[PDB]
Amino acid sequence: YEAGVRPYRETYYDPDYEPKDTDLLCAFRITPKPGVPMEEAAAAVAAESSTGTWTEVWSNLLTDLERYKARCYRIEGDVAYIAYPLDLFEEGSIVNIMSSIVGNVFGFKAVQALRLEDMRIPVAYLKTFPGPPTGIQVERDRLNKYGRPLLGGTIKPKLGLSAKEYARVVYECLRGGLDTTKDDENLNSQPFNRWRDRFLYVMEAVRKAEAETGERKGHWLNVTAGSTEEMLKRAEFAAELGSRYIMVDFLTAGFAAFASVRRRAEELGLMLHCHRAMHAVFDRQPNHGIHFRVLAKWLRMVGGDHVHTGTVVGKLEGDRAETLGIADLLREDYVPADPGRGLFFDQDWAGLKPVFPVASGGIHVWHVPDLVSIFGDDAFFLFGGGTHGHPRGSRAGATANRVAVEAVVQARNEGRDILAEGREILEEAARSCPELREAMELWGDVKFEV
Amino acid sequence: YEAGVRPYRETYYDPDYEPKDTDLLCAFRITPKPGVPMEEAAAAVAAESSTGTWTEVWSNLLTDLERYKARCYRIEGDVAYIAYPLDLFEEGSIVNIMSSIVGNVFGFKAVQALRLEDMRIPVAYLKTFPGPPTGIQVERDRLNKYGRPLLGGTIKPKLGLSAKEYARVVYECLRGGLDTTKDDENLNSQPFNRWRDRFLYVMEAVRKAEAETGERKGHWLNVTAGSTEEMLKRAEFAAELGSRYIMVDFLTAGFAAFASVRRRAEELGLMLHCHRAMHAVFDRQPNHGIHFRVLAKWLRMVGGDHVHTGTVVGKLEGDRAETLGIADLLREDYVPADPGRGLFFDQDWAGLKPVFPVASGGIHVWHVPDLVSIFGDDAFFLFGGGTHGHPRGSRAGATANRVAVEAVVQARNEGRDILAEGREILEEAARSCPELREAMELWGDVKFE
Amino acid sequence: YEAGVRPYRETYYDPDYEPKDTDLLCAFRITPKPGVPMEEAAAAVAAESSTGTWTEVWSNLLTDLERYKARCYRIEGDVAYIAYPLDLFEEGSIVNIMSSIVGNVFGFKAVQALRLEDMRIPVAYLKTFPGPPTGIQVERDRLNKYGRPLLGGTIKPKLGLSAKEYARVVYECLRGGLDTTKDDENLNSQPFNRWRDRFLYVMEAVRKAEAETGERKGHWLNVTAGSTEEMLKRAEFAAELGSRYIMVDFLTAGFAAFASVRRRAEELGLMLHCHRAMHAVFDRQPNHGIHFRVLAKWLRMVGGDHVHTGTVVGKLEGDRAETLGIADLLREDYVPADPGRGLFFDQDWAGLKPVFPVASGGIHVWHVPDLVSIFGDDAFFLFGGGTHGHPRGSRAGATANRVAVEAVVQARNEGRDILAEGREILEEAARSCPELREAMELWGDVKFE
Ligand SMILES: O=C(O)[C@@](O)(COP(=O)(O)O)[C@H](O)[C@H](O)COP(=O)(O)O
Ligand SMILES: O=C(O)[C@@](O)(COP(=O)(O)O)[C@H](O)[C@H](O)COP(=O)(O)O
Ligand SMILES: O=C(O)[C@@](O)(COP(=O)(O)O)[C@H](O)[C@H](O)COP(=O)(O)O
Ligand SMILES: [Mg+2]
Ligand SMILES: [Mg+2]
Ligand SMILES: [Mg+2]
């Protein structure tokens, strides 16, 4: 035992280490404090996230740190790779991954900025998580919808509508052609709209709309609440009414209470829509935070049936190539590394079920050619403002978005180029769908930069 | 119904609105997309965090948005003040606040960067929250420790120690002078140290140091787990073992599960230490994210007996002026606005109990003067590497830290200037404390900017 | 789809397949029906224990059997190696392992005799099991006994003693040196000895001997019973009586109820002793059955704190080399393959706790040199008859055994060869121990091949 401060890089930087198939790997993009070498910055991350602290302790000899310590085994410019033994992590606890990988190391003076770019979840650890409760293939059997993207839309205004007027919009939306509707992430239970009331009005509207159109419907009822018990209570009520769905804000509620809801959802036979509220607070800026592809893996492991992935072309920021990767990370059984899409590691999913990507935010009919091209069939397209903002109301807007999606799908199956002939495909449909014509006319000049 | 895309400013920018005592106020620091004027950007965050979306909708006429919409009532350079009516929020739900205020507005193409600097929790809303379960005064009475900062320390290595060897460190720590010790934030239940074993071994050590020193002791037993149900199971076991505390990572576990644990800790009589793991993931950079003072207000509203606030002088980043303001926001009944410390609003706490600030990370004896100067008596100082890193082990290092604290409080009470005579005071105690001398020699050249 | 019976070898024998680190591997010894070639017989076992049946089915095309079928990838004489993909199994179910591997493949007219020799449990599957609740090291801490084999003994007669007289024997065994005692495997709750009476009488005998000797003591109360709820009910009662241990016949009770009891034992703080009654019904003959080492692996996966391993030199059959390999499987973190000890695969235990080997059956003082040399310190030695059969009763027989173990352990630590000087070491101790001298004379001609 030699007591004193020694640089982190003397025990937590091993550029000869060969990662094991059981190790959990991370890809950090580091911005050292000027004068702190990259090696010392990566080693301090590897140390203060695993087993080390700022000085040598006697207790380090009471154990075998050669077996448990994390190691930075590679450095490519400002990107550090760190390998974590399997025995460091509690089984089936995303809460434990985060408490190690992103617990304290983002606030060290020596590291001025840090972003977790990607994480390789090893198979032996993945077998400790249940994955989504339903999945794409089962859910498509419960909805009896095959061969196209699924249509949805958030009810607007976000807040302010009574429970009755709320379900009146839902009803106009569903009967008009939308497969589903949802509560806004910030609509939980408020003086103007209490949850029990909204749950009772909405299911009436959901049943009524299903009965008239003959197509199965659903409304993503938001059980997000200030406690675990309250969310489980609201999920219990949603099932007693026959809802196929509930909705949770998995980041604002938190991964501990998210897991609790996910387990109850399966027990109740509910499908679990997942809203990524708060993700932009730490997955937006390239120099600091946690990329969303890491949050998506965590979401699939815990088990969400859908999760928002972005629109690229809409009102919220989303890089295309990155989104194309995140979609495969959510849907595929094995995703190989692809620097072109930001995938730093291969990702074997060990048989877990796939998650529905959801494309929401400031989209309309003109975006459907791009949206079908980006996501394919296995995804939801949500038109909130693009539905209720139609000159003639929500039912007229729902019809327009449904005909637009089905028109673009049919064109692709026929072999047409939906990106070149997108306008022509939409204009053809408009010549027999006044709802679509009016929709196109209104939002013909509404574009966001990509 | 006039359909079409309208600017967010036409309805969500009202520079004449007088904020109400019942409104929830937010101070946002905005970096608009070039070409997007400031007023519009501020209006986009107001609209999309309350009632509005990207285009007009007929259903806007089915409610009275004049009563419910959020409004940017003031702009000062790149700082936008936005008022939210009281009816917008669910009673007693931090999760709801976060789902509005920070839900989607941080990811809009029009607002390149956005940081929430401060939030005014109106009293009528604060009355829907319970506050800490124990508080400072009751805690100190349960511990029978008065007149000084309280000593603590995280057991090291963070991970790897068997239950047996881990509690032996604990025993040496509490025996040597520490009041408390704690499970590292990332120590939950792992193959090398399962939570049931650790709880049993550790509490034996606790009861054994308490009996040998005569002083009441405690260990912060981390119940953080992958699910709520599991955290409540472990909080139950800790209570059955006569532990005075439990510990939880409230940000990684999350605010919904955190509320579940806080409620059970009171029912069980446990005091609740809270670790802010994950905070620097969105409170570090000054142009984007959420300042920690806001996270500290929410913490106090749900009910944490302590929370980490940083050290200023330690290894982790933390600003002195700001940190002073976060200490008051945690301990005082009322805090007036203070641009120098980053307090954008007056904050009445409506009779909620205070929270213990905790200063931990990369600190040693040479920091004790500054620390006592910054926080005073009502605060914990945790020495992890500064206790186990001593030349003679945890026992000796814990005596050096306990002695350094009591020597700086004694001098402070005698009228000395514990900053000007910081070195002298410590050297006087070292005359009577060989442990302290070794601790000062070892880390004499270890500083942080 | 070509309907019809096709040989198993066409789709279930792939000698070019390279096993993966996630596959589950099996070493079968096969005795084909005369005329059935080894490849076909091996393919049968692989097929009928994974995906196939006696004829082609149209439903084979509704899935990718290339992804889920088992494959006999290697044959070495009469030994077939079969790899099973990881998806075929249910996470955390030994029951599911047995339903597949040993469910129907042992009764086929095509395979006259089939013996499972060994099984490679992949790390990715081991991480779905908890392992032992307590483990060797935590168990020694609870007893505060270190650095020697631990003494035990089965109360005799197996059946017939009243709860009173039963606990009288227990007291005379614990007071006289033995660290523990145990119910017999077939002693559950009977008209002559109901379980509640025995539980109350015995704990009085445990507490009384712990106070007269100053050493911690324990008794292995058999909770085995006709249903899972009855076993759990008896465990709860054992824990309310302050017992450190319960006992369960994990093979006769079954792996499903075993897992139920094991989960409740940890929840109740109970150390779990596991008797392997019925093992010899299907691990004795070398041409048919399941070798015990496979059962030992499952035991440690579910979670036993001890399990019997045989004595080698006692009254029950047991091979020395194989037993040595079984001990390593029960105690070590990684066991490399070793054809000398019948270990067909490397076994990585992925951090699970170790299991105490237990040597019982027809052993007396003269066997202590061999037993120590075979097992080392981490092991229980059980002397049922070897204790009560002492010329002067149980108290005297317990002392004679406790001294023989401690006198052989002291000699080994001093450097002596406890095998060459086994007789001498015991006679030297018998000088200061009459009880040991009397036992050595009594059984001086009792030997088992
Ligand atoms: O709050 C909103 O703006 C929405 O209701 C969209 O409204 P419109 O449908 O009227 O645009 C969705 O929550 C966002 O799209 C979420 O963004 P992400 O999916 O990127 O989390
Ligand atoms: O993980 C660590 O580094 C610590 O155990 C400190 O150990 P030393 O005291 O031995 O450095 C604490 O968790 C940090 O201080 C928390 O940071 P904050 O105080 O910002 O929450
Ligand atoms: O029933 C018996 O014979 C015993 O009580 C031994 O009595 P003694 O101590 O009087 O011999 C044990 O259960 C057997 O040794 C078990 O066999 P195994 O060890 O093979 O499981
Ligand atoms: Mg929304
Ligand atoms: Mg820590
Ligand atoms: Mg027996």
User: In terms of DSSP H, where are the helices of B69-120?
Assistant: 94-101
Query: Any residues with CB less than 8 A from the CB of C99 and at least 6 apart, and which?
Result: none
Asked if residue A310 lies in contact with residue A359, where contact means CB atoms within 8 angstroms, the answer is yes
Asked if residue A115 lies in contact with residue A291, where contact means CB atoms within 8 angstroms, the answer is yes
Burial class of B302 by CB neighbour count within 10 A (0 to 12, 13 to 18, 19+): buried
What do you get for the CA distance between the two ends of chain C, in Å? 59
Asked if residue A344 lies in contact with residue A27, where contact means CB atoms within 8 angstroms, the answer is yes
The radius of gyration of chain C's CA atoms, rounded to the nearest angstrom, is: 24
Amino acid at C10: E
Q: How far is CA C341 from CA B111, B132, C222, C328, in A?
A: 69, 62, 32, 10
Asked if residue A46 lies in contact with residue A105, where contact means CB atoms within 8 angstroms, the answer is no
In our burial notation (b when 16+ CB lie closer than 10 A, e otherwise), range B112-138 reads bbbbbbbbbbbeebbeebebbbbbbee
Q: How far is the CA of A249 from the centre of ligand 1 (A)?
A: 13
Residue A307 DSSP SS3: strand
Neighbouring CB atoms inside 10 A of C142's CB total 15
Amino acid at C258: F
Helix or strand run (H / E) with residue B231 = helix B228-240
Q: How far is the CA of C264 from the centre of ligand 6 (A)?
A: 24
Query: Any residues with CB less than 8 A from the CB of B136 and at least 6 apart, and which?
Result: B331, B353, B354, B355, B356, B378
Q: How far is CA B238 from CA A23, B144, B232, in A?
A: 32, 21, 10
User: In terms of DSSP H, where are the helices of A217-254?
Assistant: 228-240, 250-253
Any atom of ligand 2 within 6 Å of the Cβ of B185:
yes
Asked if residue C235 lies in contact with residue C260, where contact means CB atoms within 8 angstroms, the answer is no
Burial class of A118 by CB neighbour count within 10 A (0 to 12, 13 to 18, 19+): buried
Asked if residue C345 lies in contact with residue C27, where contact means CB atoms within 8 angstroms, the answer is yes
Asked if residue C336 lies in contact with residue C328, where contact means CB atoms within 8 angstroms, the answer is no
Written in H, E and C, the secondary structure of B376-416 is CCCCEEECCHHHHCCCCCHHHHHHHHHHHHHHHHHHHHCCC
Asked if residue B165 lies in contact with residue B382, where contact means CB atoms within 8 angstroms, the answer is no
Query: Any residues with CB less than 8 A from the CB of B244 and at least 6 apart, and which?
Result: B142, B143, B216, B218, B270, B271
Phi/psi for B440 (5° steps) reads -75, -40
* Resolution to 1 decimal place, in Å: 2.7
> E-strand spans in A343-417?
347-348, 356-360, 380-382
| DSSP letter (8 states) at residue A105 | G
Q: Sheet containing B71-76: which strands, arranged edge to edge?
A: B71-76, B79-84, B24-32, B111-120, B289-290
Phi/psi for A434 (5° steps) reads -55, -35
Residues from chain C that touch B192, judged by Cβ atoms under 8 A, are 351
Phi/psi for A48 (5° steps) reads -75, 0
Q: HSE (CB half, 13 Å, CA atoms) of A20?
A: 14
Q: What is the dihedral of CA B365, B367, B373, B378, to 10 degrees?
A: -60
- Angle in degrees, CA A348, A352, A356, rounded to 5: 105
Residue (of C182, A96, C332) closest to B252 by Cα position: A96
C-alpha torsion sign, points A301, A302, A303, A307 = negative
Query: Is the Cβ pair C124, A86 closer than 8 Å?
Result: no
Strand A347-348 to A334-335 pairing: antiparallel
Any atom of ligand 3 within 6 Å of the Cβ of C384:
yes
- Token pair 């539980």 is at which residue? C199
Question: Closest partner residue to C266 among B162, B191, B196, by Cβ?
Answer: B196
Quick one: how far is CA C79 from the chain centroid?
24
Rounded to the nearest 10 degrees, the angle between the axes of helix A228-240 and helix A255-268 is 20
Instruction: Give the pair of three-digit tokens for residue C4.
Output: 């019809």
C-alpha torsion sign, points B333, B338, B342, B346 = positive
| DSSP letter (8 states) at residue A62 | G
Instruction: Give the pair of three-digit tokens for residue A323.
Output: 């989104």
- Nearest chain B residue to A259 by CA distance is B227
Written in H, E and C, the secondary structure of chain C is CCCCCCCCHHHHECCCCCCCCCCEEEEEEEEECCCCCHHHHHHHHHHHCCCCCCCCCHHHHHCCHHHHCCEEEEEECCEEEEEECHHHCCCCCHHHHHHHHCCCCCCCCCEEEEEEEEEECCHHHHCCCCCCCCCHHHHHHHHCCCCCCEEECECCCCCCCCHHHHHHHHHHHHCCCCCEEECCCCCCCECCECHHHHHHHHHHHHHHHHHHHCCCCEEECECCCCCHHHHHHHHHHHHHCCCCEEEEEHHHHCHHHHHHHHHHHHHCCCEEEEECCCHHHCCCCCCCEECHHHHHHHHHHHCCCEEECCCCCCCCCCCHHHHHHHHHHHHCCEECCEHHHCECCCEECCCCCCCEEEEECCCCHHHHHHHHHHHCCCCEEECCHHHHCCCCHHHHHHHHHHHHHHHHHHHHHHCCCCCCCHHHHHHHHHHCCHHHHHHHHHCCCCCCC
Residue (of A150, A115, A158) closest to A277 by Cα position: A158
Which ligand is closest in space to the CA of residue B104? 1
Nearest CA to ligand 3 atom 1: C184
Hey, is the C-beta of A348 within 8 angstroms of any chain C C-beta?
no
The Cα C354–Cα C140 span in angstroms is 12
A150 forms beta bridges with: A380
The Cα C67–Cα C52 span in angstroms is 13
Q: Which of residues 19-58 of B touch A (CB under 8 A)?
A: 48-58
Residue (of B183, B278, C21) closest to A94 by Cα position: B278
Q: How far is CA B371 from CA A75, B153, B314, B367, B437, in A?
A: 37, 15, 10, 6, 19
Q: Which of residues 242-281 of C touch B (CB under 8 A)?
A: 266, 269
Hey, is the C-beta of C137 within 8 angstroms of any chain B C-beta?
yes
Q: Sheet containing B306-308: which strands, arranged edge to edge?
A: B150-152, B380-382, B356-360, B306-308
Nearest CA to ligand 3 atom 6: C361
Q: Which atom of ligand 1 sits closest to the CA of residue A385?
A: 10
The Cα A55–Cα A77 span in angstroms is 27
Quick one: how far is CA B301 from the chain centroid?
12
Instruction: Give the pair of three-digit tokens for residue C395.
Output: 């108290």
- Token pair 């129907």 is at which residue? C104
The Cα B137–Cα A317 span in angstroms is 48
Method: X-ray
Q: HSE (CB half, 13 Å, CA atoms) of B20?
A: 13
The Cα A195–Cα C84 span in angstroms is 50
Residue (of A68, A74, A40) closest to A54 by Cα position: A40
Asked if residue B202 lies in contact with residue B218, where contact means CB atoms within 8 angstroms, the answer is no
- Angle in degrees, CA A359, A148, A333, rounded to 5: 70
Best residue of B129, B228, B283, B285 to probe chain A, by most A CBs closer than 10 Å: B228
Amino acid at A162: S
Q: HSE (CB half, 13 Å, CA atoms) of A197?
A: 14
Phi/psi for C57 (5° steps) reads -130, 145
Catalytic positions of A: 156, 275
C358 forms beta bridges with: C308, C380
Any atom of ligand 1 within 6 Å of the Cβ of A7:
no
Burial class of C334 by CB neighbour count within 10 A (0 to 12, 13 to 18, 19+): exposed
Asked if residue B200 lies in contact with residue B164, where contact means CB atoms within 8 angstroms, the answer is no
B26 forms beta bridges with: B82, B119
The Cα C22–Cα C41 span in angstroms is 25
The Cα B291–Cα C178 span in angstroms is 64
Asked if residue A248 lies in contact with residue A276, where contact means CB atoms within 8 angstroms, the answer is no
The radius of gyration of chain B's CA atoms, rounded to the nearest angstrom, is: 24
Strand B271-275 to A79-84 pairing: unpaired
Hey, is the C-beta of B192 within 8 angstroms of any chain C C-beta?
yes
Asked if residue B70 lies in contact with residue B51, where contact means CB atoms within 8 angstroms, the answer is yes
C-alpha torsion sign, points C182, C183, C185, C188 = negative
Q: How far is CA B278 from CA A40, A169, A427, B254, B342, in A?
A: 21, 39, 50, 10, 22
Q: Which of residues 390-419 of B touch A (CB under 8 A)?
A: 390-391, 393-394
